[PDB]
Design a binder for this molecule. Structure first.
Ligand SMILES: *[C@@H]1O[C@H](CO[C@@H]2O[C@@H](C)[C@@H](O)[C@@H](O)[C@@H]2O)[C@@H](O[C@@H]2O[C@H](CO)[C@@H](O[C@H]3O[C@H](CO)[C@@H](O)[C@H](O)[C@@H]3O)[C@H](O)[C@H]2NC(C)=O)[C@H](O)[C@H]1NC(C)=O
Ligand SMILES: *[C@@H]1O[C@H](CO[C@@H]2O[C@@H](C)[C@@H](O)[C@@H](O)[C@@H]2O)[C@@H](O)[C@H](O)[C@H]1NC(C)=O
Ligand SMILES: *[C@@H]1O[C@H](CO)[C@@H](O)[C@H](O)[C@H]1NC(C)=O
Ligand SMILES: N[C@@H](CC(=O)O)C(=O)O
Ligand SMILES: [Cl-]
Ligand SMILES: [Zn+2]
Length: 607
């Protein structure tokens, strides 16, 4: 570790710490920066050499964390936690969690190499027939094809190609991760990840929220299953069984907006999927990013700085470089460099993703002058909610009209149902998936789910919560959880469930602050400087204060609350319940064993 980066001397008392954190920060920014830069160089250009460089940067960060962390415990382990400065004990608390720096050097190196190899396997996996990538090729197939066999080829191909080789690496990763966090006093890595929400009742609170939301999902599920039955027929859809997992528009069946055209209740009203209009008008990634930016500046939040435009990767490279296409936002911790890395495609759903990613960047811009340990969301769910809240305004028919994407204007009950159904496909359909992923992973970290049951427990959860089934037989050689980005890329998931509840709480509060008095689902906060100021207060806080307090200031309640989501969807919630009753549906999937048959001649009968 460079002499300039090593910790010096301090008093073994409460006073010996503010100068400590200032010195830490001076060096931490340099270390964080070099780590983020090496990660960027790999993720935008996957090579063995860039993996090696990223692994060297990771070792340095671990050296740095070990040095600064052993000092805390030398000086303060018996006595720290006690009074004056709130932001200071947060900064200290973060410095003394060693994590992977607890591993001996050989295991640090193994851990870093595992992360690099898992990332490569996921982001370079292909389905061969010249071979198809996940993004754009398989993603486009899942979104647009109505060929059962083609969808199956893409789904099976992807899950086999990505999941199977990940399994042994994921096992080794899990063991090392647990070994690391156990030395910080956590029972397993999952307990560490949950500790970020600073709630002794987190898992119970989540379960109680899910109980309120589940009826909405079950009714959406039953209606969508019927719509699919009318297209695919009785061979491939069981009206009392789980929906085959490849028919819902998305590789993970995690959101269903791409099958909107099959489910739209009133097809004679204006067409709310504006993708075809975006393509007709010649939108490109650049336009999408500038349009999102202009929403942020309408609220008097910050534009994207020049360094963002110069350094970001906004389209998949056309030079045959391998890249991590999965959309992500990047803080370089130098208060200057902030970037998005997205293989942007021209679609409505991608415009929402652009807003999502830009919300992260806006957070980074607003807290860039805080101490580096405080440059985080109030919790990770807050970070995920910011862009989505703006996208809720952008997606309204009235806003789409303002930006030239929806010519017809209508305000009638049928049009409302269409809109709320489209939004339900995006937001309600996600809820079970958002909830189940870290239920799976928490069980893996705890040892409740050993390698012998990775797939059995994954599919238990997928069927339990989503009411889907794999469209081909699976066994434990398959590792279908590994075919979802966040698993091999070690990114926690519960943040997205939290976000999907939180964003409606934020939307309600911002709409009220804006002076809007109509139905919550027709609110557009565009050009509300007052809504902008309220949001800015959240963003500038970082993690300086407990999330419960930040939330209370913003929305008037100190807790996650489903009521604003329920209020937003009330009309369609009622409508779906009535339609399923009238159509004679069974809610749920009592034929829980059911899987669909294979297509004739599969896979040979596909062009
Ligand atoms: C789409 O129509 C919604 C319903 O409009 C109402 O009913 C129609 C049949 C028609 O007669 C129309 O003229 C009616 O107003 C609109 O929602 C309504 O928007 C009103 C204006 O913001 C709102 O009003 C009052 O709301 C409260 C009282 O509950 C007062 O505090 C406030 O001062 C307003 O005067 C009304 O409540 C609201 N209705 C509902 C059911 O929410 C909606 O704005 C419109 N949308 C668009 C995009 O045009
Ligand atoms: C796991 O499954 C592998 C391939 O899939 C198999 O073939 C299809 C047609 C299904 O109907 C079912 O028979 C299987 O899922 C097999 O190669 C492999 O042997 C299986 N793994 C183990 C340990 O048995
Ligand atoms: C990709 O990385 C390699 C090192 O592995 C380097 O030689 C090459 O120039 C990089 N390409 C781009 C376009 O940055
Ligand atoms: N980074 C986001 C991408 C998206 O919103 O589509 C998740 O994961
Ligand atoms: Cl999280
Ligand atoms: Zn995000």
């Amino acid at each position: 570790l460079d002499p300039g980066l090593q910790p010096g001397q301090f008093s073994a008392d409460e006073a010996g710490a503010q100068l400590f954190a200032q010195s830490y920060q001076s060096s931490a920014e340099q270390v964080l920066f070099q780590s983020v830069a090496a990660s960027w160089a790999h993720d935008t250009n996957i090579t063995a050499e860039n993996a090696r460089r990223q692994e060297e940067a990771a070792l340095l960060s671990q050296e740095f964390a070990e040095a600064w962390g052993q000092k805390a415990k030398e000086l303060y382990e018996p006595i720290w936690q006690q009074f004056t400065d709130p932001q200071l004990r947060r900064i200290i608390g973060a410095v003394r969690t060693l994590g992977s720096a607890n591993l001996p050097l050989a295991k640090r190196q193994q851990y870093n190499a595992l992360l690099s190899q898992m990332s490569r396997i996921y982001s370079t996996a292909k389905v061969c027939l010249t071979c198809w990538s996940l993004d754009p090729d398989l993603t486009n197939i899942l979104a647009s094809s109505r060929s059962y066999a083609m969808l199956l080829f893409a789904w099976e191909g992807w899950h086999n190609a990505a999941g199977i080789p990940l399994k042994p690496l994921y096992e080794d990763f899990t063991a090392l991760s647990n070994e690391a966090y156990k030395q910080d006093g956590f029972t397993d890595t999952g307990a560490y990840w949950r500790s970020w929400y600073n709630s002794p009742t987190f898992e119970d609170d989540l379960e109680h929220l899910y109980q309120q939301l589940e009826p909405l999902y079950l009714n959406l599920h039953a209606f969508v299953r019927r719509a699919l039955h009318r297209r695919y027929g009785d061979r491939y859809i069981n009206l009392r069984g789980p929906i085959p997992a490849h028919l819902l528009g998305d590789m993970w069946a995690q959101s269903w907006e791409n099958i909107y055209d099959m489910v739209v209740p009133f097809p004679d009203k204006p067409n709310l999927d504006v993708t075809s209009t975006m393509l007709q008008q010649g939108w490109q990634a650049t336009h999408m990013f500038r349009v999102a930016e202009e929403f942020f500046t309408s609220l008097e939040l910050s534009p994207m700085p020049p360094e963002f435009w110069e350094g970001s990767m906004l389209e998949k490279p056309a030079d045959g470089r391998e890249v991590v296409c999965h959309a992500s936002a990047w803080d370089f911790y130098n208060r200057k460099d902030f970037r998005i890395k997205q293989c942007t495609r021209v679609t409505m759903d991608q415009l929402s993703t652009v807003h999502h990613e830009m919300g992260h960047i806006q957070y980074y811009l607003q807290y860039k002058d805080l101490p580096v340990s405080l440059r985080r969301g109030a919790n990770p769910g807050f970070h995920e909610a910011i862009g989505d809240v703006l996208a809720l305004s952008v997606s309204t028919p009235e806003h789409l009209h303002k930006i030239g994407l929806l010519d017809r204007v209508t305000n009638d009950t049928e049009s409302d149902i269409n809109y709320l159904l489209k939004m339900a496909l995006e937001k309600i359909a996600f809820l079970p998936f958002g909830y189940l992923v870290d239920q799976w992973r928490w069980g893996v970290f705890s040892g409740r789910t050993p390698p012998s049951r990775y797939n059995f427990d994954w599919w238990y959860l997928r069927t339990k919560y989503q009411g889907i089934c794999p469209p081909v037989t699976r066994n434990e050689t398959h590792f279908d959880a590994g075919a979802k980005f966040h698993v091999p890329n070690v990114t926690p998931y519960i943040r997205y469930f939290v976000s999907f509840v939180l964003q409606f709480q934020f939307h309600e509060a911002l709409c009220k602050e804006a002076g809007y008095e109509g139905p919550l689902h027709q609110c557009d906060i565009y050009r509300s400087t007052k809504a902008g100021a309220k949001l800015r207060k959240v963003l500038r806080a970082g993690s300086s204060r407990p999330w419960q307090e930040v939330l209370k200031d913003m929305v008037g309640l100190d807790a996650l609350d489903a009521q604003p989501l329920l209020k937003y969807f009330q009309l369609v919630t009622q409508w779906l319940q009535e339609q399923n009753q009238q159509n004679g549906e069974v809610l749920g999937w009592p034929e829980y064993q059911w899987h669909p048959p294979l297509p004739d001649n599969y896979p040979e009968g596909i062009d």
